[PDB]
Amino acid sequence: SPPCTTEELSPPPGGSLVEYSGGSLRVPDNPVVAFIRGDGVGPEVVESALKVVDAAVKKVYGGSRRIVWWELLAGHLAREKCGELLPKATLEGIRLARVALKGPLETPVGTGYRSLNVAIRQALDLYANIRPVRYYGQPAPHKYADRVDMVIFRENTEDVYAGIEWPHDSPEAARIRRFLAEEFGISIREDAGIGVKPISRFATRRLMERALEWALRNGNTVVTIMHKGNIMKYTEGAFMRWAYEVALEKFREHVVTEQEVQEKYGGVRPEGKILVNDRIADNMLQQIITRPWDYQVIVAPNLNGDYISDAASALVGGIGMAAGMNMGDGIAVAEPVHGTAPKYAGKDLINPSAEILSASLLIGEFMGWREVKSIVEYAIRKAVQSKKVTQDLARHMPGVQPLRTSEYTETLIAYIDEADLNEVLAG
Amino acid sequence: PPCTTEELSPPPGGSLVEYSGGSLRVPDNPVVAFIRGDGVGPEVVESALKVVDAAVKKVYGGSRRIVWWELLAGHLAREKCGELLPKATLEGIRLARVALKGPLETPVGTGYRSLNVAIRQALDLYANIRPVRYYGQPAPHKYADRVDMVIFRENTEDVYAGIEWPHDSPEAARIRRFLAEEFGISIREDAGIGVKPISRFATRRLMERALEWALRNGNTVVTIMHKGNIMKYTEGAFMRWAYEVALEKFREHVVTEQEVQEKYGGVRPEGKILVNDRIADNMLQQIITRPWDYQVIVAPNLNGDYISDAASALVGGIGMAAGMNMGDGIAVAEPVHGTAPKYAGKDLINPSAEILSASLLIGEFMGWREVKSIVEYAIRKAVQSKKVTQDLARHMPGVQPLRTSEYTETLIAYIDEADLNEVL
């Protein structure tokens, strides 16, 4: 059934394609959604996510909407069937559907860290990494976990993560050291490894526009630029300047800067406007710990985004529950932050929440089916409240017998099925 | 109070600290320099000198005493001297070996990011040391009482070295075309560009100082914080070089996680330091989730900056964070906080950060380890009985803030009254 070649690519019979034209995504009510089971715990958590999503859509839409799941292959199932880890057909499949849910992939051989994931983002130009962090009532190390409700928009193509670097003892490094010294009078130690940190106007703008669009569509009232612009003036400082610039250029009537509030509006953010402000990166880390209620949408370059999203997830006791999505222009692939968890693969022990919440982000936010997100979040909060959870959560709760992955899936489905919509979908 | 070099002279009652063959030797009447600096500066340092002297008077009985030597930097330097940072002041530090300073204002147009950069560079203070501990304050972290860490941060290299060029600069254009022709590397025309250098020499130095501190303090874990999975040849090399020097110079004192698993049944032998490593974003997660698993953290410049800041926030200790910049036989301690201009002169400021800087200097670098036990004891006591300044009082319903001077007095009493048989 799943395709190995371009010629074999055909979406399943009664699904219709999500389309993207004129800056606008068009989602039919019977949308094709690609899925990739991936590796390790991926197949298990992907299976759980499909079942929970199907139940959610039946529940809130009662037949007026249905997802048409389209299986594509990457990782070990692709090696088995197709003889390669990432068939071109899989890439073209995602491009055709525009939307995909995927499990984690193992890193091949001696290739880059998560090289398959990188190959996917690169082929599809998925420049924005989006990570929501919310609290579900779980045991958490943060006293203020219930005030953490954030999304990190992380530029995912540039920064030190771009891979531009050379070994200390390499002839490349020696050539750079000499170039730097003769041309610019810059001295770098002979025994120094060397990395390059590029940050561009183009990539910053694209990311900030997408962040601002999320804020407008979600009714967020603050977008915070996280940067180390005091020390790194021409990369991170520039990121900050360019991010402000595009906000004022393209969303002028929707935004006000902190600067403008504190000299034009008397400390009060006017009604109907998004506050766009900025925080020095190390201070930003302190601030989500100390005053998390002050932050909603966070916009960051690659590394900063990586750090702040991870810190936020830990605060809410959400490390293994964190969802994410990599988004381009009118195309998105959602997946959990966690890896393949090899020691849990196939044991029906893993928490499928991350994968479920990844589907919920894809369908609820990117595709616009908000009520699916509402009911899914409701179901997860209910399970947590009722102590009907997998071991990673249950071990922190006295007297509680942990659920198997499959049991927790059926528990979420029961809660979804039994939900009083008048209460769940209000406001 | 000096303005120039050929007028440097330690106060007559005291003796100089000396460094000789990797060994600090400290007399019982030492000279320690102190710079009052700017804003709340003069206040917190004044409070600090008075607390530490009470601490030394009590803990040793009067067999020991500090001889404080006033040097100037910032507003008091530009006033008396004509300049923001006398060559004298710097040379006085090099002579005395040990210094305590308040925070400083950097005017724009100086060439340096901060006046502190200038002091570190002149004196080769390559290691930034930040202890993070909990004193019973209101704190956002449920596990704050199990945060007891020291961050050894490499303070000379990394993206913080200032090597970068504007996107539209001729320099950036030249680098872009060099990288393209020579290595087939493409960077966008509209990209700003920074260089991240990490060297074997700087890493080794830092790691050695960290391991020495661990041994001196009976720490049982030293954790290398790196992003070596993505930045193989900078942060990964930092990690490899740190391990390499631990095993080369501290073999008989250290053990790795693999060694503990394979040779010792998964249990660290009591007299050995566990040397391990964590991916940097995971490390952030781990100090939040399992702070008890971490003590000494060894990081390159940026990583150290981020993790120390996160840890201070967890303990509700942002304004209480102490720090020290250390070279080979030289140290200058100072608060992490700035000048705080609006509290300057107003007797409102929490002097704890400066006291802790002193006690880090005198008790951890000068080695009078009983001075730190009683200072830290004193601060915990003050917080526990809710005798604190408004920064802390404002998170304690119904508590009335003490003034700076009042808090200083309170701390003195707790030191003079302490039971040494329970504290030491």
PDB file of N, CA and C in Angstrom, chain A residues 113 140-143 160-161 165-168 172 175 179 183-184 189 191-193 195-202 228 230-234 242 281-282 286 289-290 304 306-307 310 319, chain B residues 113 139-142 159-160 164-167 174-175 178 183 188 190-201 227 230-234 241 280-281 285 288-289 303 305-306 309 318:
ATOM      1  N   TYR A 113      23.348  14.515  13.214  1.00  0.00           N
ATOM      2  CA  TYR A 113      22.318  14.338  14.232  1.00  0.00           C
ATOM      3  C   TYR A 113      20.974  14.576  13.530  1.00  0.00           C
ATOM      4  N   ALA A 140       4.595  18.879  38.506  1.00  0.00           N
ATOM      5  CA  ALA A 140       5.499  19.798  37.835  1.00  0.00           C
ATOM      6  C   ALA A 140       6.395  20.451  38.884  1.00  0.00           C
ATOM      7  N   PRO A 141       7.636  20.721  38.511  1.00  0.00           N
ATOM      8  CA  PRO A 141       8.611  21.324  39.426  1.00  0.00           C
ATOM      9  C   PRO A 141       8.486  22.859  39.578  1.00  0.00           C
ATOM     10  N   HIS A 142       7.666  23.490  38.736  1.00  0.00           N
ATOM     11  CA  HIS A 142       7.434  24.935  38.729  1.00  0.00           C
ATOM     12  C   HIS A 142       6.186  25.238  39.532  1.00  0.00           C
ATOM     13  N   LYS A 143       6.311  26.068  40.561  1.00  0.00           N
ATOM     14  CA  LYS A 143       5.142  26.575  41.298  1.00  0.00           C
ATOM     15  C   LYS A 143       4.139  27.314  40.393  1.00  0.00           C
ATOM     16  N   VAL A 160      24.180  29.065  14.657  1.00  0.00           N
ATOM     17  CA  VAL A 160      25.225  28.074  14.825  1.00  0.00           C
ATOM     18  C   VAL A 160      24.766  26.647  14.460  1.00  0.00           C
ATOM     19  N   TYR A 161      23.449  26.415  14.416  1.00  0.00           N
ATOM     20  CA  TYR A 161      22.913  25.089  14.055  1.00  0.00           C
ATOM     21  C   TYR A 161      23.007  24.765  12.553  1.00  0.00           C
ATOM     22  N   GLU A 165      31.336  24.960  10.352  1.00  0.00           N
ATOM     23  CA  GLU A 165      32.389  24.832  11.364  1.00  0.00           C
ATOM     24  C   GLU A 165      33.496  23.928  10.857  1.00  0.00           C
ATOM     25  N   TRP A 166      34.673  24.058  11.461  1.00  0.00           N
ATOM     26  CA  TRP A 166      35.837  23.297  11.054  1.00  0.00           C
ATOM     27  C   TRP A 166      36.644  22.846  12.269  1.00  0.00           C
ATOM     28  N   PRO A 167      37.200  21.638  12.219  1.00  0.00           N
ATOM     29  CA  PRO A 167      38.080  21.143  13.296  1.00  0.00           C
ATOM     30  C   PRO A 167      39.285  22.053  13.566  1.00  0.00           C
ATOM     31  N   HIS A 168      39.710  22.145  14.833  1.00  0.00           N
ATOM     32  CA  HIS A 168      40.869  22.952  15.228  1.00  0.00           C
ATOM     33  C   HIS A 168      42.152  22.631  14.445  1.00  0.00           C
ATOM     34  N   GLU A 172      41.347  23.711   6.750  1.00  0.00           N
ATOM     35  CA  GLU A 172      40.316  24.731   6.575  1.00  0.00           C
ATOM     36  C   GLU A 172      40.414  25.783   7.675  1.00  0.00           C
ATOM     37  N   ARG A 175      43.415  27.992   7.312  1.00  0.00           N
ATOM     38  CA  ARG A 175      43.180  28.959   6.241  1.00  0.00           C
ATOM     39  C   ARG A 175      42.318  30.141   6.751  1.00  0.00           C
ATOM     40  N   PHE A 179      43.340  34.095   7.036  1.00  0.00           N
ATOM     41  CA  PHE A 179      42.457  35.071   6.421  1.00  0.00           C
ATOM     42  C   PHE A 179      42.044  36.139   7.429  1.00  0.00           C
ATOM     43  N   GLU A 183      43.587  40.080   6.974  1.00  0.00           N
ATOM     44  CA  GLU A 183      42.591  40.931   6.347  1.00  0.00           C
ATOM     45  C   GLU A 183      41.918  41.863   7.321  1.00  0.00           C
ATOM     46  N   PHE A 184      41.659  41.366   8.523  1.00  0.00           N
ATOM     47  CA  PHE A 184      40.850  42.087   9.483  1.00  0.00           C
ATOM     48  C   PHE A 184      41.604  42.389  10.762  1.00  0.00           C
ATOM     49  N   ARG A 189      43.172  31.749  18.336  1.00  0.00           N
ATOM     50  CA  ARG A 189      44.195  30.801  18.781  1.00  0.00           C
ATOM     51  C   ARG A 189      44.399  29.666  17.766  1.00  0.00           C
ATOM     52  N   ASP A 191      44.932  26.663  18.346  1.00  0.00           N
ATOM     53  CA  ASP A 191      44.268  25.432  18.814  1.00  0.00           C
ATOM     54  C   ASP A 191      42.757  25.616  18.997  1.00  0.00           C
ATOM     55  N   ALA A 192      42.186  26.563  18.250  1.00  0.00           N
ATOM     56  CA  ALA A 192      40.743  26.819  18.287  1.00  0.00           C
ATOM     57  C   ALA A 192      39.997  26.127  17.157  1.00  0.00           C
ATOM     58  N   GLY A 193      38.955  25.392  17.512  1.00  0.00           N
ATOM     59  CA  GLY A 193      37.896  25.027  16.581  1.00  0.00           C
ATOM     60  C   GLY A 193      37.117  26.285  16.213  1.00  0.00           C
ATOM     61  N   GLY A 195      33.500  27.930  14.457  1.00  0.00           N
ATOM     62  CA  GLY A 195      32.149  27.940  13.919  1.00  0.00           C
ATOM     63  C   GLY A 195      31.733  29.318  13.402  1.00  0.00           C
ATOM     64  N   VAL A 196      30.800  29.326  12.451  1.00  0.00           N
ATOM     65  CA  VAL A 196      30.264  30.564  11.877  1.00  0.00           C
ATOM     66  C   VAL A 196      28.747  30.645  12.186  1.00  0.00           C
ATOM     67  N   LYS A 197      28.300  31.822  12.616  1.00  0.00           N
ATOM     68  CA  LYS A 197      26.925  32.070  13.010  1.00  0.00           C
ATOM     69  C   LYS A 197      26.278  33.065  12.034  1.00  0.00           C
ATOM     70  N   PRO A 198      25.555  32.586  11.024  1.00  0.00           N
ATOM     71  CA  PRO A 198      24.848  33.493  10.103  1.00  0.00           C
ATOM     72  C   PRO A 198      23.423  33.771  10.561  1.00  0.00           C
ATOM     73  N   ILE A 199      23.006  35.029  10.514  1.00  0.00           N
ATOM     74  CA  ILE A 199      21.619  35.400  10.752  1.00  0.00           C
ATOM     75  C   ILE A 199      21.203  36.413   9.703  1.00  0.00           C
ATOM     76  N   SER A 200      20.178  36.081   8.925  1.00  0.00           N
ATOM     77  CA  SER A 200      19.788  36.921   7.797  1.00  0.00           C
ATOM     78  C   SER A 200      18.456  37.637   7.979  1.00  0.00           C
ATOM     79  N   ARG A 201      18.349  38.757   7.280  1.00  0.00           N
ATOM     80  CA  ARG A 201      17.152  39.558   7.258  1.00  0.00           C
ATOM     81  C   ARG A 201      15.946  38.736   6.753  1.00  0.00           C
ATOM     82  N   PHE A 202      16.111  38.097   5.597  1.00  0.00           N
ATOM     83  CA  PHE A 202      15.074  37.246   4.992  1.00  0.00           C
ATOM     84  C   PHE A 202      14.483  36.228   5.963  1.00  0.00           C
ATOM     85  N   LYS A 228      20.292  37.898  22.111  1.00  0.00           N
ATOM     86  CA  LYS A 228      21.466  38.276  22.879  1.00  0.00           C
ATOM     87  C   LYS A 228      22.154  39.438  22.132  1.00  0.00           C
ATOM     88  N   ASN A 230      22.877  42.473  22.820  1.00  0.00           N
ATOM     89  CA  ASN A 230      23.849  43.309  23.500  1.00  0.00           C
ATOM     90  C   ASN A 230      25.289  42.840  23.262  1.00  0.00           C
ATOM     91  N   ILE A 231      25.474  41.527  23.150  1.00  0.00           N
ATOM     92  CA  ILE A 231      26.800  40.907  22.942  1.00  0.00           C
ATOM     93  C   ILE A 231      27.040  40.584  21.470  1.00  0.00           C
ATOM     94  N   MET A 232      26.013  40.016  20.832  1.00  0.00           N
ATOM     95  CA  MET A 232      26.054  39.643  19.419  1.00  0.00           C
ATOM     96  C   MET A 232      25.229  40.639  18.590  1.00  0.00           C
ATOM     97  N   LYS A 233      25.832  41.799  18.340  1.00  0.00           N
ATOM     98  CA  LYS A 233      25.124  42.950  17.782  1.00  0.00           C
ATOM     99  C   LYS A 233      24.613  42.720  16.361  1.00  0.00           C
ATOM    100  N   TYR A 234      25.407  42.015  15.560  1.00  0.00           N
ATOM    101  CA  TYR A 234      25.175  41.932  14.119  1.00  0.00           C
ATOM    102  C   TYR A 234      24.508  40.646  13.657  1.00  0.00           C
ATOM    103  N   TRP A 242      15.399  43.539  12.818  1.00  0.00           N
ATOM    104  CA  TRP A 242      14.633  43.128  11.657  1.00  0.00           C
ATOM    105  C   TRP A 242      13.235  42.624  12.012  1.00  0.00           C
ATOM    106  N   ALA A 281      18.389  37.263  26.102  1.00  0.00           N
ATOM    107  CA  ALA A 281      18.155  35.812  26.165  1.00  0.00           C
ATOM    108  C   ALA A 281      18.260  35.210  27.556  1.00  0.00           C
ATOM    109  N   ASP A 282      19.315  35.554  28.299  1.00  0.00           N
ATOM    110  CA  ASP A 282      19.467  34.994  29.639  1.00  0.00           C
ATOM    111  C   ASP A 282      18.397  35.543  30.564  1.00  0.00           C
ATOM    112  N   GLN A 286      15.178  33.687  32.735  1.00  0.00           N
ATOM    113  CA  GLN A 286      14.806  34.024  34.112  1.00  0.00           C
ATOM    114  C   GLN A 286      13.330  34.404  34.195  1.00  0.00           C
ATOM    115  N   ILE A 289      10.688  31.760  34.185  1.00  0.00           N
ATOM    116  CA  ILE A 289      10.711  31.115  35.492  1.00  0.00           C
ATOM    117  C   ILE A 289      10.012  31.988  36.516  1.00  0.00           C
ATOM    118  N   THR A 290      10.278  33.293  36.449  1.00  0.00           N
ATOM    119  CA  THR A 290       9.793  34.208  37.482  1.00  0.00           C
ATOM    120  C   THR A 290       8.409  34.809  37.194  1.00  0.00           C
ATOM    121  N   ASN A 304      18.571  29.982  20.638  1.00  0.00           N
ATOM    122  CA  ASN A 304      17.729  30.544  21.691  1.00  0.00           C
ATOM    123  C   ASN A 304      16.366  29.852  21.782  1.00  0.00           C
ATOM    124  N   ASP A 306      15.581  26.818  20.783  1.00  0.00           N
ATOM    125  CA  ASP A 306      15.851  25.485  21.290  1.00  0.00           C
ATOM    126  C   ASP A 306      15.917  25.499  22.834  1.00  0.00           C
ATOM    127  N   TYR A 307      16.741  26.373  23.385  1.00  0.00           N
ATOM    128  CA  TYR A 307      16.895  26.462  24.839  1.00  0.00           C
ATOM    129  C   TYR A 307      15.594  26.843  25.579  1.00  0.00           C
ATOM    130  N   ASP A 310      12.786  24.157  25.498  1.00  0.00           N
ATOM    131  CA  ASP A 310      13.112  23.055  26.409  1.00  0.00           C
ATOM    132  C   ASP A 310      12.916  23.435  27.876  1.00  0.00           C
ATOM    133  N   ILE A 319       8.338  17.398  29.714  1.00  0.00           N
ATOM    134  CA  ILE A 319       9.489  17.066  28.856  1.00  0.00           C
ATOM    135  C   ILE A 319       9.139  16.040  27.776  1.00  0.00           C
TER     136      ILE A 319
ATOM    137  N   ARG B 113      32.491  46.687  25.952  1.00  0.00           N
ATOM    138  CA  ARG B 113      31.068  46.405  26.195  1.00  0.00           C
ATOM    139  C   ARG B 113      30.715  46.882  27.600  1.00  0.00           C
ATOM    140  N   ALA B 139      10.483  31.354  46.302  1.00  0.00           N
ATOM    141  CA  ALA B 139      11.102  30.909  45.076  1.00  0.00           C
ATOM    142  C   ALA B 139      10.077  30.176  44.229  1.00  0.00           C
ATOM    143  N   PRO B 140      10.188  30.317  42.910  1.00  0.00           N
ATOM    144  CA  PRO B 140       9.239  29.692  41.976  1.00  0.00           C
ATOM    145  C   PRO B 140       9.478  28.192  41.770  1.00  0.00           C
ATOM    146  N   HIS B 141      10.630  27.687  42.203  1.00  0.00           N
ATOM    147  CA  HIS B 141      11.030  26.314  41.929  1.00  0.00           C
ATOM    148  C   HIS B 141      10.657  25.476  43.155  1.00  0.00           C
ATOM    149  N   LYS B 142       9.840  24.436  42.979  1.00  0.00           N
ATOM    150  CA  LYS B 142       9.502  23.559  44.118  1.00  0.00           C
ATOM    151  C   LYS B 142      10.757  22.903  44.679  1.00  0.00           C
ATOM    152  N   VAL B 159      30.980  32.926  21.145  1.00  0.00           N
ATOM    153  CA  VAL B 159      30.351  34.043  20.432  1.00  0.00           C
ATOM    154  C   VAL B 159      30.506  35.369  21.184  1.00  0.00           C
ATOM    155  N   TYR B 160      30.808  35.286  22.476  1.00  0.00           N
ATOM    156  CA  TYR B 160      31.017  36.477  23.295  1.00  0.00           C
ATOM    157  C   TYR B 160      32.339  37.226  23.045  1.00  0.00           C
ATOM    158  N   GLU B 164      32.441  39.591  14.832  1.00  0.00           N
ATOM    159  CA  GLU B 164      31.233  39.654  14.017  1.00  0.00           C
ATOM    160  C   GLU B 164      31.266  40.895  13.110  1.00  0.00           C
ATOM    161  N   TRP B 165      30.428  40.876  12.067  1.00  0.00           N
ATOM    162  CA  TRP B 165      30.377  41.945  11.072  1.00  0.00           C
ATOM    163  C   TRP B 165      28.935  42.209  10.642  1.00  0.00           C
ATOM    164  N   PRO B 166      28.548  43.477  10.493  1.00  0.00           N
ATOM    165  CA  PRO B 166      27.201  43.805   9.994  1.00  0.00           C
ATOM    166  C   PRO B 166      26.925  43.167   8.617  1.00  0.00           C
ATOM    167  N   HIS B 167      25.668  42.790   8.381  1.00  0.00           N
ATOM    168  CA  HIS B 167      25.222  42.223   7.110  1.00  0.00           C
ATOM    169  C   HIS B 167      25.595  43.035   5.875  1.00  0.00           C
ATOM    170  N   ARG B 174      33.393  40.363   2.131  1.00  0.00           N
ATOM    171  CA  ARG B 174      34.668  39.680   1.884  1.00  0.00           C
ATOM    172  C   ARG B 174      34.641  38.250   2.466  1.00  0.00           C
ATOM    173  N   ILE B 175      34.150  38.113   3.693  1.00  0.00           N
ATOM    174  CA  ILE B 175      34.039  36.797   4.322  1.00  0.00           C
ATOM    175  C   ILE B 175      33.095  35.862   3.582  1.00  0.00           C
ATOM    176  N   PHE B 178      35.019  34.687   0.418  1.00  0.00           N
ATOM    177  CA  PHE B 178      36.041  33.757   0.889  1.00  0.00           C
ATOM    178  C   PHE B 178      35.428  32.398   1.244  1.00  0.00           C
ATOM    179  N   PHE B 183      35.625  27.140   0.387  1.00  0.00           N
ATOM    180  CA  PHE B 183      34.997  25.998   1.030  1.00  0.00           C
ATOM    181  C   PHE B 183      33.627  25.657   0.462  1.00  0.00           C
ATOM    182  N   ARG B 188      23.687  33.853   2.955  1.00  0.00           N
ATOM    183  CA  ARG B 188      22.893  34.854   2.237  1.00  0.00           C
ATOM    184  C   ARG B 188      23.555  36.235   2.264  1.00  0.00           C
ATOM    185  N   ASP B 190      22.226  38.954   2.767  1.00  0.00           N
ATOM    186  CA  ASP B 190      21.640  39.819   3.783  1.00  0.00           C
ATOM    187  C   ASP B 190      21.813  39.242   5.198  1.00  0.00           C
ATOM    188  N   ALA B 191      22.886  38.487   5.398  1.00  0.00           N
ATOM    189  CA  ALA B 191      23.186  37.874   6.693  1.00  0.00           C
ATOM    190  C   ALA B 191      24.307  38.602   7.426  1.00  0.00           C
ATOM    191  N   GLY B 192      24.053  38.906   8.693  1.00  0.00           N
ATOM    192  CA  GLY B 192      25.105  39.290   9.610  1.00  0.00           C
ATOM    193  C   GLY B 192      25.887  38.027   9.936  1.00  0.00           C
ATOM    194  N   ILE B 193      27.153  38.178  10.303  1.00  0.00           N
ATOM    195  CA  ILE B 193      28.038  37.027  10.472  1.00  0.00           C
ATOM    196  C   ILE B 193      28.881  37.135  11.724  1.00  0.00           C
ATOM    197  N   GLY B 194      28.793  36.116  12.565  1.00  0.00           N
ATOM    198  CA  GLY B 194      29.656  35.968  13.724  1.00  0.00           C
ATOM    199  C   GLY B 194      30.521  34.713  13.689  1.00  0.00           C
ATOM    200  N   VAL B 195      31.659  34.779  14.375  1.00  0.00           N
ATOM    201  CA  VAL B 195      32.569  33.652  14.495  1.00  0.00           C
ATOM    202  C   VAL B 195      32.580  33.171  15.940  1.00  0.00           C
ATOM    203  N   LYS B 196      32.547  31.850  16.103  1.00  0.00           N
ATOM    204  CA  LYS B 196      32.573  31.202  17.401  1.00  0.00           C
ATOM    205  C   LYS B 196      33.869  30.387  17.524  1.00  0.00           C
ATOM    206  N   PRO B 197      34.898  30.944  18.152  1.00  0.00           N
ATOM    207  CA  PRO B 197      36.131  30.179  18.406  1.00  0.00           C
ATOM    208  C   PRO B 197      36.120  29.490  19.779  1.00  0.00           C
ATOM    209  N   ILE B 198      36.495  28.209  19.823  1.00  0.00           N
ATOM    210  CA  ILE B 198      36.688  27.485  21.104  1.00  0.00           C
ATOM    211  C   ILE B 198      38.029  26.748  21.041  1.00  0.00           C
ATOM    212  N   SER B 199      38.905  27.067  21.984  1.00  0.00           N
ATOM    213  CA  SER B 199      40.275  26.570  21.981  1.00  0.00           C
ATOM    214  C   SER B 199      40.592  25.536  23.062  1.00  0.00           C
ATOM    215  N   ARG B 200      41.509  24.636  22.709  1.00  0.00           N
ATOM    216  CA  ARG B 200      42.015  23.606  23.614  1.00  0.00           C
ATOM    217  C   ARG B 200      42.559  24.234  24.904  1.00  0.00           C
ATOM    218  N   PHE B 201      43.419  25.245  24.744  1.00  0.00           N
ATOM    219  CA  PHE B 201      44.066  25.934  25.868  1.00  0.00           C
ATOM    220  C   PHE B 201      43.069  26.500  26.876  1.00  0.00           C
ATOM    221  N   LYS B 227      26.814  21.720  23.463  1.00  0.00           N
ATOM    222  CA  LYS B 227      25.943  21.352  22.342  1.00  0.00           C
ATOM    223  C   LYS B 227      26.755  20.628  21.263  1.00  0.00           C
ATOM    224  N   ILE B 230      25.482  19.179  17.746  1.00  0.00           N
ATOM    225  CA  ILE B 230      25.308  20.065  16.584  1.00  0.00           C
ATOM    226  C   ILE B 230      26.565  20.842  16.248  1.00  0.00           C
ATOM    227  N   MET B 231      27.263  21.322  17.270  1.00  0.00           N
ATOM    228  CA  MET B 231      28.500  22.050  17.055  1.00  0.00           C
ATOM    229  C   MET B 231      29.661  21.157  17.466  1.00  0.00           C
ATOM    230  N   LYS B 232      30.002  20.254  16.548  1.00  0.00           N
ATOM    231  CA  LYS B 232      31.007  19.213  16.782  1.00  0.00           C
ATOM    232  C   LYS B 232      32.388  19.759  17.106  1.00  0.00           C
ATOM    233  N   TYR B 233      32.808  20.806  16.399  1.00  0.00           N
ATOM    234  CA  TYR B 233      34.201  21.225  16.469  1.00  0.00           C
ATOM    235  C   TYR B 233      34.457  22.414  17.369  1.00  0.00           C
ATOM    236  N   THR B 234      33.390  22.951  17.966  1.00  0.00           N
ATOM    237  CA  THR B 234      33.536  23.992  18.987  1.00  0.00           C
ATOM    238  C   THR B 234      33.121  23.460  20.351  1.00  0.00           C
ATOM    239  N   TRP B 241      38.016  17.950  25.092  1.00  0.00           N
ATOM    240  CA  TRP B 241      39.180  18.517  25.759  1.00  0.00           C
ATOM    241  C   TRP B 241      39.045  18.550  27.291  1.00  0.00           C
ATOM    242  N   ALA B 280      23.328  20.775  26.152  1.00  0.00           N
ATOM    243  CA  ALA B 280      23.032  22.047  26.793  1.00  0.00           C
ATOM    244  C   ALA B 280      21.545  22.318  27.059  1.00  0.00           C
ATOM    245  N   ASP B 281      20.662  22.102  26.073  1.00  0.00           N
ATOM    246  CA  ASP B 281      19.240  22.308  26.340  1.00  0.00           C
ATOM    247  C   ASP B 281      18.717  21.232  27.309  1.00  0.00           C
ATOM    248  N   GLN B 285      16.929  21.595  31.219  1.00  0.00           N
ATOM    249  CA  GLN B 285      15.787  20.800  31.650  1.00  0.00           C
ATOM    250  C   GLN B 285      16.108  20.068  32.955  1.00  0.00           C
ATOM    251  N   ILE B 288      16.141  21.998  36.216  1.00  0.00           N
ATOM    252  CA  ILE B 288      14.754  22.224  36.614  1.00  0.00           C
ATOM    253  C   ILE B 288      14.127  20.947  37.196  1.00  0.00           C
ATOM    254  N   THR B 289      14.422  19.825  36.563  1.00  0.00           N
ATOM    255  CA  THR B 289      13.761  18.578  36.907  1.00  0.00           C
ATOM    256  C   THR B 289      14.457  17.814  38.039  1.00  0.00           C
ATOM    257  N   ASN B 303      26.799  29.165  27.113  1.00  0.00           N
ATOM    258  CA  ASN B 303      26.116  28.149  27.933  1.00  0.00           C
ATOM    259  C   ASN B 303      26.164  28.440  29.449  1.00  0.00           C
ATOM    260  N   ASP B 305      26.598  31.420  30.909  1.00  0.00           N
ATOM    261  CA  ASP B 305      25.776  32.615  31.088  1.00  0.00           C
ATOM    262  C   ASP B 305      24.292  32.208  31.249  1.00  0.00           C
ATOM    263  N   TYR B 306      23.798  31.399  30.320  1.00  0.00           N
ATOM    264  CA  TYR B 306      22.400  30.973  30.367  1.00  0.00           C
ATOM    265  C   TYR B 306      22.068  30.109  31.589  1.00  0.00           C
ATOM    266  N   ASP B 309      22.164  31.972  35.046  1.00  0.00           N
ATOM    267  CA  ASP B 309      20.969  32.807  35.122  1.00  0.00           C
ATOM    268  C   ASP B 309      19.678  32.039  35.406  1.00  0.00           C
ATOM    269  N   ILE B 318      17.704  36.057  42.014  1.00  0.00           N
ATOM    270  CA  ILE B 318      18.219  36.888  40.913  1.00  0.00           C
ATOM    271  C   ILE B 318      19.043  38.074  41.390  1.00  0.00           C
TER     272      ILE B 318
END
